[PDB]
From Swiss-Prot, chain B:
Biotechnological exploitation: Co-administration of salinamide and rifampicin or salinamide and myxopyronin suppresses the emergence of resistance to both antibiotics.
Known role: DNA-dependent RNA polymerase (RNAP) catalyzes the transcription of DNA into RNA using the four ribonucleoside triphosphates as substrates. Resistance to the antibiotics salinamide A, salinamide B, rifampicin, streptolydigin, CBR703, myxopyronin, and lipiarmycin can result from mutations in this protein.
UniProt superkingdom: Bacteria
Protein family (similarity comment): Belongs to the RNA polymerase beta chain family.
Name of the protein in question: DNA-directed RNA polymerase subunit beta
UniProt PTM comment: Acetylated on several lysine residues in the presence of glucose.
Subunit comment: The RNAP catalytic core consists of 2 alpha, 1 beta, 1 beta' and 1 omega subunit. When a sigma factor is associated with the core the holoenzyme is formed, which can initiate transcription. The rRNA transcription and antitermination complex (rrnTAC) consists of RNAP, NusA, NusB, NusE (rpsJ), NusG, SubB, ribosomal protein S4, DNA and precursor rRNA; S4 is more flexible than other subunits. In pull-down experiments interacts with CedA.
Lineage of origin: Bacteria, Pseudomonadati, Pseudomonadota, Gammaproteobacteria, Enterobacterales
Organism of provenance: Escherichia coli (strain K12)
Curated annotation (Swiss-Prot), chain C:
Segments for region (Alpha N-terminal domain (alpha-NTD)): 1-229
Effect of R39C: In rpoA112; temperature-sensitive, blocks RNA polymerase assembly
Organism of derivation: Escherichia coli (strain K12)
Protein name (database record): DNA-directed RNA polymerase subunit alpha
Any Pfam family hit: RNA_pol_A_CTD
UniProt modified residues of type ADP-ribosylarginine: R249
Keyword Transcription in record: yes
Length: 109, 50, 308
């Protein structure tokens, strides 16, 4: 072996009985929830926000239909007009354009 | 067998003295800097050398 | 009532060493004046010093040049001690170009319009190989005190190319100062003192000029004592409320509810706003829908509110 790499980054939890323990990682959904928790939303608004951010894919686009989201709520007075407003508020988060229904909406936002 | 290319990068920086740094002689006398005084504030002899 | 000192018998031992004398002084004024002048001279005296150097073939301070004995770091350290004088300019550029065998000094620096090298024997490099060439451009700036090369960040406003080497700047020509108080030769007066100030510089500044500058600084500082006396920001907010393109039906309601700006809209909670007359469940959602398009959720809490 003419050229050998230096050791890659690795570690193991020491001085702790449950060895290697763990380490939490921040994903897109976790960051979206963290942002949601720090904006003024009603209880219904919070529920709608959680429901719509649960459906965010890895690429940042919504996989489920808005009408399907309304059906998922399964409660009166939560018609598509309210969920549209909540989703449009959610779209303007740190990854601007996240939770977009299609490419057109993403470019528009 | 797995790797394909390796790149190694070196960075060099200059560390200057500051109040937080530690300084010690070779007689067991150690300590940390408390303040970096200006020249005109330090004591001087009759020749004006601080 | 009080006698006044006059600068008499100014004498120059050497190019750097010098003596300044003030003959008439009162009982206690000698030490006060001496210490004040020493502090002013050692603290704040203007001068010119090397700011950055750009060598031909090098890229960073931690490199080497084929044909020169020293590293670029030692070249910069030697250049840091260069003593120059500039008239009428603060950003002169001193170009240097020399090839051959032997040490290179400040003597071979190209003769600029108004640039004087007080010490022309300052060795800054050593050339060892016959066919070796060196060529740099030295920028000299005028300053007042010690400025490290890391504190200045404003120089990063414009991109600097790879190859410009930043050196520290001292700007202080004065290196050592002492003073003594001796009995004056004036016999008609009861008891007078005399002040002798000895200074060691790098030859950049005149002794008399330094004394005048220190005295002027002291007087300008003392001028203040002679008369004491003395005994909603984000542009998205504060916009007209008729920028959201709301319905006609909500247009009348906002006027009745005394909402005239975008900012005052965002400070209302859902529970109490619904109690307002004839809002409508579906119409209120459109107000939230439009305000969501701007990123301002309903119910924000500000501190102060100007009329505009």
């Amino acid at each position: 072996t003419a050229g050998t790499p230096s050791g890659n980054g690795v570690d193991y939890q020491d001085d702790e009985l449950p060895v290697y323990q763990g380490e939490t990682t921040q994903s897109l959904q976790d960051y979206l929830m963290w942002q949601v928790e720090l904006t003024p939303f009603t209880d219904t608004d919070r529920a709608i926000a959680t429901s719509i951010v649960d459906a965010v894919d890895d690429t940042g686009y919504l996989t489920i239909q808005i009408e399907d989201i309304v059906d998922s709520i399964g409660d009166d007075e939560i018609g598509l007009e309210e969920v549209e407003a909540v989703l449009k508020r959610i779209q303007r988060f740190d990854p601007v354009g996240v939770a977009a229904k299609d490419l057109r909406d993403c470019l528009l936002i | 067998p797995g790797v394909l290319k390796i790149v190694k990068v070196y960075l060099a920086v200059k560390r200057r003295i500051q109040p937080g740094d530690k300084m010690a002689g070779r007689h067991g006398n150690k300590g940390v800097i408390s303040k970096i005084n200006p020249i005109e504030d330090m004591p001087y002899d009759e020749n004006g050398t601080p | 009532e009080f006698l006044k000192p006059r600068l008499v018998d100014i004498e120059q031992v050497s190019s750097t060493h010098a003596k300044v004398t003030l003959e008439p002084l009162e009982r206690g004024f000698g030490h006060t004046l001496g210490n004040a002048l020493r502090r002013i001279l050692l603290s704040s005296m203007p001068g010119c010093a090397v700011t950055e150097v750009e060598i031909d073939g090098v890229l960073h301070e931690y490199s080497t040049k084929e044909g020169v004995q020293e590293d670029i770091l030692e070249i910069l350290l030697n250049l840091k001690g260069l003593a120059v004088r500039v008239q009428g300019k603060d950003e002169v550029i001193l170009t240097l170009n020399k090839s051959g065998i032997g040490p290179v000094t400040a003597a071979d620096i190209t003769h600029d319009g108004d640039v004087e090298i007080v010490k022309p024997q300052h060795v800054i490099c050593h050339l060892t190989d016959e066919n070796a060439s060196i060529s740099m451009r030295i920028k000299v700036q005028r300053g007042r005190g010690y400025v490290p090369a890391s504190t200045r960040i404003h120089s990063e406003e414009d991109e600097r190319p790879i190859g410009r080497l930043l050196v520290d700047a001292c700007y202080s020509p004065v290196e050592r100062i002492a003073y003594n108080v001796e009995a004056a030769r004036v016999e008609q007066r009861t008891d007078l003192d005399k002040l002798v100030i000895e200074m060691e510089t790098n030859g950049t500044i005149d002794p008399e000029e330094a004394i005048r500058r220190a005295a002027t600084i002291l007087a300008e500082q003392l001028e203040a004592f002679v008369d004491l006396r003395d005994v909603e920001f984000d542009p998205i907010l504060l916009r007209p409320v008729d920028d959201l393109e709301l319905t006609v039906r909500s247009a009348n309601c906002l006027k009745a509810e005394a909402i005239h700006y975008i900012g005052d809209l965002v400070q209302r909670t859902e529970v109490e706003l619904l109690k307002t007359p004839n809002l409508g469940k579906k119409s209120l959602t459109e107000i939230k829908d439009v305000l969501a398009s701007r990123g301002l959720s309903l119910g924000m809490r500000l501190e102060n509110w100007p009329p505009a």
